[PDB]
Amino acid sequence: TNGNGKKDDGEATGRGTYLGSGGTAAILRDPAGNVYRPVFFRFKNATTQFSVGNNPVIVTLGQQQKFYFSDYVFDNNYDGRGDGFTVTVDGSNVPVIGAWKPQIKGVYGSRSGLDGTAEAGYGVYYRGVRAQITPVGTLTAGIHYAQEGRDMFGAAQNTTSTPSDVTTYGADLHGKAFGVELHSEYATSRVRPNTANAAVQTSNAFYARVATRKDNLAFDLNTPAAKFGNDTFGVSLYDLNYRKIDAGYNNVAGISEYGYGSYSRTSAQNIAYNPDTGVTAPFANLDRQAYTDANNDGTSDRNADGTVVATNTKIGQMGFGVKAAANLGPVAIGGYYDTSTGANGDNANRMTEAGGSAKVAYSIFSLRGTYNTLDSNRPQIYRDAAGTQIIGDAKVRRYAVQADVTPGLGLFVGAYYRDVNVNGVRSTTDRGLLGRGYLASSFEPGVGNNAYRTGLRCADNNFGTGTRDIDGVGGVLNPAVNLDQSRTATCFTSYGVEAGHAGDNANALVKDLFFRVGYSRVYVPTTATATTGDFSGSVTYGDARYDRKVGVANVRLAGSFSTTNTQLDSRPAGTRGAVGLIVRTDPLENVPFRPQFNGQVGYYTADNRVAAGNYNANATKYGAGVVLNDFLLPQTKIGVRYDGYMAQNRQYTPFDGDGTQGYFSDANNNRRTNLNGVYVEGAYQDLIFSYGTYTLSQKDLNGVEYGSGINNGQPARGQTFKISYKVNF
Amino acid sequence: LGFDTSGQFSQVTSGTGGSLFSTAGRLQVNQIDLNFGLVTGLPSDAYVDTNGNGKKDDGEATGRGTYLGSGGTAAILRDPAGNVYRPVFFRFKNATTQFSVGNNPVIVTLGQQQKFYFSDYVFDNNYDGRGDGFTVTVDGSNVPVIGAWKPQIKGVYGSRSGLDGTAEAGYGVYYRGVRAQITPVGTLTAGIHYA
Amino acid sequence: RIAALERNAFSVKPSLTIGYSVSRTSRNFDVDRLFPLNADGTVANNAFTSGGIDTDTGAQRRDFGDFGNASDPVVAGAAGLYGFADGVSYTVYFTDGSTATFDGLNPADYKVPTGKVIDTTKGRNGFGFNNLARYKEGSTDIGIS
Amino acid sequence: RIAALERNAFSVKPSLTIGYSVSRTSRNFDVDRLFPLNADGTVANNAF
Ligand SMILES: [Ca+2]
Ligand SMILES: [Ca+2]
Ligand SMILES: [Ca+2]
Ligand SMILES: [Ca+2]
Ligand SMILES: [Ca+2]
Ligand SMILES: [Ca+2]
Ligand SMILES: [Ca+2]
Ligand SMILES: [Ca+2]
Ligand SMILES: [Ca+2]
């Protein structure tokens, strides 16, 4: 009724207004068996634009116009703005300037068309125009002008926070010329607030990069922008940029849909590229965070889970960066640098990161070095040594040395040594502080691949810290999960060694066999907040996986192992192991009927040395099924299926409404579960009979059944019989 | 005015189905009795059945009283310049409720009010039926050793009256049975049954 | 002439459904967690799955009961057998003809909202147990569209 | 092609009625008992 296109509360349902149009209630009928149903006309139009004319001039009239001038100016190609028209003039065919490919765009529209008096788009209109040429190579230059304001009716009844008018103009230069890719953009804005006799606010943005850009409109930073020499003696530049974003620049000042804040405040803090909201701006409008004290008790407010509550103020951004590399035959080196601060240039928001690398690789051997640095004077949210979340300065220094060898076949061996020193003291973990930058880079093992790819290699040769699974036995019965490829991404302070095998390679000792084994020692300080310490931690892990086809049976088995005396990530101390097996067979043509079998079995044990008290968790899952593809009658087949699951000190957390799936996990609830049943299905011609009975019981120790929920000592139960028959006219 | 279609839509064919296995489709053709067509108005006998009992109880609204302009003399939905509007309805009536699948020997029937008859004093429900279920019939006329005795086995399962209220006699009531039969000499037919 | 006639023609496509179903359960719980997992990560199909897969909210077929005619979601904690079955709940009988639902296991842990008082006469001190059994009476359904 | 078109076709059958009638009575009584009885036992048809 209100025209918003959504079902609000109280609006009548479709079947409630037209009785007899569906459902079980209110069947409009007639004695002698007649049944009447109203006839409706259903339609749905997916077209809203109407382009008229042919080249050069094309004019489009639409209902939600999508357009895009530049990154920081007048970018509304995600959902659109409102009702209007768009004109495009292309001058590719013209005598004098036909080689430069001129192009002119024009935009007019009204925000959201009809709007209520309390909506932001009541009596608000926009307009713009952009010119463009492509003089040399791919290098494209252009200028544009944008405008949006209130009319005489909007200025008096809009009752919202939309500014009186916004005027924006700028220029850009994107393309690749003379073997060098260059991107730049300048933009100036003037916003007049809706309040009476208010001053005009001026805010401008500017940046200039030398880097590669994808058709996705996101910068690659892994392919060089400008090179020199060849693979033997080569020097390549990956990035070189300068930026200056004003504090008052946002979506309103740019006449866009979504603002230019940081996509995340923990990873790539300086980057505003948001795939979800379709923001293609390369640089962000930074935030300075601080403690919050609402009730004013003298203590900073914290959430229910212990996370701090922070207040965000908008500072600009102004800094420069660089990233290069150099190949010298076998030896390869790299490096990066990046600094940032507020738009005003104050040193109280400075964050500087720098580092380097090295590599030598002859024949099968390899050797790598690394160094990293963070000097964020800007307040950042991270956990302290004890484990309490804080806000403040952060300094990180990391260096790692990694050796490798590939003696042929699928074999590989690798040893490493890593060291992290946060805030002047040795630490077990860097607490995620090294991820705030966006230029950190490292090499990759091998010979001939000297690419300086972004991202620290903190997840190489590490163990796994997983705790959640969906099959119920730790992931050994899940064909879609590789247990040997699970590696934690946190940067530890450890040294170890790992040996493995990869059966997917063309040359491999055993085909379709994957396994690994390792041993690392983690650094643990004397106390929680002490300075001294030693590598007291110890981890020993091993994984396996083997897929094969023997005869008609496809056999797959997996395994895992772990044993630690320290807590890592969310995984507690103590040993842990799990094994599995899945068998599937094709129908046997040589025996009476045509039976094909199925089966699976899994076991999972875990001794948890948690502080609250040591407990043990168990799991056991099995299955079996026989399908007789040819029963006594010519077109009859039958099948049976038996399943079971025995758990102990395990639980299942259902799905979160935000989008996170459920999982199984250990819990010291002191309860033993036992869920099993049978499933019999048989078909005659195309008529299918389905039967199934199941039973779930959950009794704690000393034997007190809780299945029924009424405390009568009986388990839960279920049964279902179904006859199915599908017909087509 | 009324719209009537042809009678080509009087036969259906089976389709593939199953979970542990997939069956071959188009294995059986079933004859059905559908009489459907578009109508421009409602008769005065129509009503709105809210309780699902299939009868016009007291208080249930009439068909023409809910859809104004669909019939009668009162409440004519018109337009000046003489235009008169009447809603268009879809009328149908199915006289088929059973679906027999398979051929000899074994025939299985799935229906909505199953009619069956074991003997005079036992399990005789061939007048109006009992409820929702299935019936299987096995005929052993063609078989090497006992083909001359014409053996026959019947099977019956169902839920009495299907869905019922808590106060009706058929709420949560299920029946089952089986009967064997031979014809050794002449017309003399002997048999046993269970219910 | 035939081409013009086919342009202004309606393709009549009637539909028909048939099938029988009966289901009984003392308490509604999920059984999709017992079936084998395919290589792509989806559980094997079965005839007793009232599972609503929703990638937007993270819902899966293992998060809902399958034994009644209702898709009762499982409940975490001791109230719902630790995520394995539908959770216990109570109804609260307030004075002046109003009721509220308490979604826990122990009725001695309910907070009374300000401005309301429970009626001790109705139920057990104003708390009525919500039955957990689900029944689908045996019936065959013929649907014509 | 024509056979398929006729399968998915609707047979339009409009109807039309026409007639005049007037009737008066001091008291409503029956007159079907005055008409002859056929051999099958049914009275002869009449317009009233
Ligand atoms: Ca609405
Ligand atoms: Ca508007
Ligand atoms: Ca609108
Ligand atoms: Ca965009
Ligand atoms: Ca406080
Ligand atoms: Ca009724
Ligand atoms: Ca009934
Ligand atoms: Ca019944
Ligand atoms: Ca389910």
Author numbering:
A (entry chain C): 439 to 1167
B (entry chain A): 390 to 584
C (entry chain C): 245 to 389
D (entry chain A): 245 to 292
The authors write:
We have solved the atomic structure of a highly abundant protein, SlpA, and discovered that it forms extended structures that link the outer membrane (OM) to the peptidoglycan (PG). Our structure shows that SlpA exhibits a tripartite organization, with its C-terminal part forming a homotrimeric 30-stranded OM β-barrel (OMBB), its central part forming a trimeric coiled coil that can traverse the large periplasmic space, and the extreme N-terminal part forming an SLH domain trimer that can interact with the PG layer. Our results indicate that SlpA cannot fully tile the OM and that it is not a fundamental component of the S-layer, but that it connects the OM to the PG layer by forming extended homotrimers. Deletion of slpA leads to substantial disruption of the D. radiodurans cell envelope, suggesting its important role in the maintenance of cell envelope integrity.
We performed single-particle analysis on this cryo-EM data to solve a global 3.3-Å resolution structure of SlpA, with the best resolution in the β-barrel of 2.9 Å at the core. The structure showed that SlpA forms a homotrimer of 30-antiparallel–stranded β-barrels (30 β-strands per SlpA monomer). The SlpA β-barrel is the first structurally characterized 30-stranded barrel and one of the largest single-chain β-barrels observed. The C-terminal OMBB of the D. radiodurans SlpA is preceded by a long, homotrimeric coiled-coil segment, which, in our cryo-EM map, is well resolved from residue 215 onwards. When compared to its homologs, the OMBB of D. radiodurans SlpA (residues 254 to 1167) contains several insertions positioned within the pore. Residues 272 to 377 form the most extensive, ordered insertion that lines the cavity of the pore. This insertion appears to be stabilized by a canonical bacterial SLP metal ion–binding site coordinated by residues D274, D276, and D310. Although density for metal ions is resolved in our cryo-EM map, the identity of the metal is unknown. The protein:protein interface of the SlpA β-barrel consists mainly of stacked β-sheets from apposing barrels. These sheets contain a hydrophobic patch made up of residues L260, I262, Y264, I386, I388, L390, and F392 stacking onto V401, F479, F481, F488, and L499 from the next subunit. The coiled coil consists of a highly conserved, prominent salt bridge between E232 and R227.
